[PDB]
Ligand binder design. Structure first.
Ligand SMILES: CC(C)(COP(=O)(O)OP(=O)(O)OC[C@H]1O[C@@H](n2cnc3c(N)ncnc32)[C@H](O)[C@@H]1OP(=O)(O)O)[C@@H](O)C(=O)NCCC(=O)NCCS
Ligand SMILES: Nc1ncnc2c1ncn2[C@@H]1O[C@H](COP(=O)(O)OP(=O)(O)O)[C@@H](O)[C@H]1O
Ligand SMILES: [Mg+2]
Ligand SMILES: [Mg+2]
Lengths: 255, 259
């Protein structure tokens, strides 16, 4: 339901959560793309690895590009389904963290900003999204609970959205039905162990009880701010090519 | 530990009110601690002494209240006012407890030799992090040489969780995840304290360590890898007595393959 992006998007349309205008799956794209309008972002349905995407600015580009986009999606993801989505030209990436149990309770652990991106891959993530109003933040929290309730969501997953910088509108983009690399920032500002929750949950536990590791929605409270960086061997002075071999000395910093 | 988890909210408020009166009646500037004894029989608290400074244990109060104590010290001596966003500190009313913490200090004090600190080269050093774990180290690292002249301290470990039992097992997980080689540590002794029933159910007095032992104390270590390497080196250099003067298998013949 959430694996395929079109099916996921259709899910959200069905429970009243906003989306960007997107086509059906794709040898005559526009007509179709032309109904959406340019510019558009081409996205692999299924497989969403922080990118097999492509911005198409005009019809003359379409033929080479969709084809290429397809050979790649088959390459990287192995399923080959692409659809066109209307491009949000100026965008912030915000996302809701949700926990659902085997008994139908679902809670949000507020949002993260992950707009710090390198060609659509997440680089720096922050909790809460610093530039949000208390009401926008409640607006998002409520969509993600409608998305989770809808799929009787069991465990941890993430609901991701594009904020349109020009209007401050939200548009559901995808679900990740899994823990994420950036979960950690949500953990330190809420005090809630997401992994222990995962396990308590499939043990059959009820969210809101001590043995679930998860508070009732009303006792889930934001405390400060946090951000996460990933240290890699990608060498800034050598085209970010990943270095490797032996680490001979290593001292990380705490406190 | 922080908070002290055996206290009633009446005893905490009672304790905290005495402290603002020892402090106000000296116009104390900076950070300071007011120590009390508590008779476990009556639950009655006795003033004992004041330390006019940050203590080794400030980190637990930091993680449980989210107030940087060092930064408060500097801000305060810059002239800032308690309450101001630009002091370190919120108003009393906005000062709040959040879950639980305990600190253990990892050292070279040897349990297996009466707690004399060990000294020498640290050949391996890995420490453990993750959610709810704070470390205050910087002195140790592989290669480092522990001298006999100062403090035996290697690193201070602070573990946070929403309740005290979960904090104990967070500490227990991080402690046991530590690998320190080249020198002796107090890790086993730290692990025994925190795995103790009297610790888990908060019924220890100050006489607990000097009393419990229950030697604890001991059990050794297998050190199997080193043993195997010893064997391989021995047979590699000297040969095996059953094989060394007898015919030899045809050189690099195939390992057997399990069908
Ligand atoms: C504790 O270990 P112990 O009782 O001294 O001795 P062991 O018999 O476990 O020897 C283990 C050695 O094998 C190796 N080893 C231990 N756990 C291991 C694992 N899960 N996988 C691979 N190698 C391992 C290490 O060199 C280890 O030393 P350690 O104590 O630093 O882990
Ligand atoms: N329709 C769009 N318009 C503008 N930018 C987009 C659009 N769709 C995706 N992006 C950018 O690509 C990123 C990844 O999108 P997402 O659907 O989560 O793909 P993935 O499955 O690779 O995570 C988003 O954070 C956003 O920055
Ligand atoms: Mg994504
Ligand atoms: Mg004293």
């Amino acid at each position: 339901q959430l694996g395929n992006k079109v099916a996921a998007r259709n899910l959200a349309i069905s429970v009243g959560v906003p989306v960007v205008p997107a086509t059906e799956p794709l040898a005559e794209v526009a007509k179709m793309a032309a109904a959406i309008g340019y510019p558009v972002m081409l996205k692999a349905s299924w497989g969403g690895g922080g990118r097999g995407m492509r911005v198409i600015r005009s019809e003359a580009d379409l033929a080479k590009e969709v084809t290429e986009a397809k050979r790649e999606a088959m390459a990287a993801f192995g399923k080959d389904e692409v659809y066109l989505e209307k491009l949000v030209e100026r965008a912030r990436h915000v996302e809701s963290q949700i926990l659902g149990d085997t008994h139908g309770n679902v809670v949000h652990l507020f949002e993260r900003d992950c707009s710090v991106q390198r060609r659509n891959q997440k680089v720096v993530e922050r909790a809460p999204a610093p530039y949000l109003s208390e009401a926008q933040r409640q607006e998002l929290a409520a969509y993600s609970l409608k998305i989770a309730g809808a799929t009787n969501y069991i465990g941890a997953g993430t609901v991701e959205y594009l904020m349109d910088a020009d209007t401050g509108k939200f548009y559901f983009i995808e679900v990740n039905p899994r823990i994420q690399v950036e979960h950690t920032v949500t953990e330190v500002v809420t005090g809630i162990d997401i992994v222990k929750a995962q396990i308590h949950i499939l043990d059959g536990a009820a969210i809101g009880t001590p043995q679930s590791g998860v508070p009732n929605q009303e006792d889930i409270r934001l405390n400060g701010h946090a951000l996460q960086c990933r240290v890699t061997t990608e060498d800034p002075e050598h085209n970010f090519i990943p270095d490797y071999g032996r680490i001979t000395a290593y001292r990380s910093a705490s406190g | 530990r922080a908070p002290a988890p055996y206290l009633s909210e009446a005893q905490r408020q009672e304790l905290a009110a005495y402290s603002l009166k020892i402090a106000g009646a000296t116009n104390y500037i900076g950070a300071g601690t007011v120590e009390y004894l508590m008779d476990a029989d009556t639950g009655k608290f006795y003033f004992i002494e004041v330390n006019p400074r940050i203590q080794v244990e400030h980190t637990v109060t930091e993680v449980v209240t989210g107030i940087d104590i060092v930064k408060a010290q500097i801000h305060i001596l810059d002239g800032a006012a308690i309450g101001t966003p630009q002091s370190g500190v919120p108003n009393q009313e906005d000062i709040r407890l959040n879950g639980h913490a305990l600190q253990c200090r990892v050292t070279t004090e040897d349990p297996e030799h009466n707690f004399i600190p060990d000294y020498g080269r640290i050949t391996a050093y890995r420490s453990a992090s993750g959610f709810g774990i704070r470390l205050d180290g910087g002195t140790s690292y592989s290669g480092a040489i522990i001298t006999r002249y100062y403090d035996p301290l290697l690193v201070k470990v602070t573990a946070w969780a929403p309740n005290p039992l979960e904090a104990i097992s967070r500490m227990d997980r991080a402690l046991r995840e530590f690998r320190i080689r080249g020198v002796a540590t107090n890790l086993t002794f730290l692990e025994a304290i925190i795995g103790h029933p009297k610790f888990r159910d908060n019924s220890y007095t100050t006489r607990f360590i000097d009393t419990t032992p229950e030697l604890f104390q001991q059990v050794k270590r297998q050190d199997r890898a080193t043993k195997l390497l010893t064997y391989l080196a021995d047979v590699t250099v000297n040969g095996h007595p059953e094989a060394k003067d007898r015919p030899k298998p045809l050189e690099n013949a195939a390992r057997p393959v399990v069908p």
